[PDB]
Design a protein that fits this description.
Length: about 60
């Protein structure tokens, strides 16, 4: 839903990396959050929300 609420503005490379990490684990550690942010150059808050949102896609109810 990146057509109504603008915020998940990421790049193919960034999403690819994040997706790779998510494939291994739907969660995120402190070190991973800060590492991913520093590695790709994104806000830890954005990464955290991205993972939380990605997890909601699988587990509905």
């Amino acid at each position: 839903m990146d057509e109504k609420r603008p915020r998940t503005a990421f790049s193919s490379e960034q999403l690819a990396r994040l997706k790779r990490e998510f494939n291994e684990n739907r969660y995120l550690t402190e070190r991973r959050r800060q590492q991913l942010s520093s590695e790709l150059g994104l806000n830890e808050a954005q990464i955290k929300i991205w993972f939380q949102n990605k997890r909601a896609k699988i587990k509905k109810s």
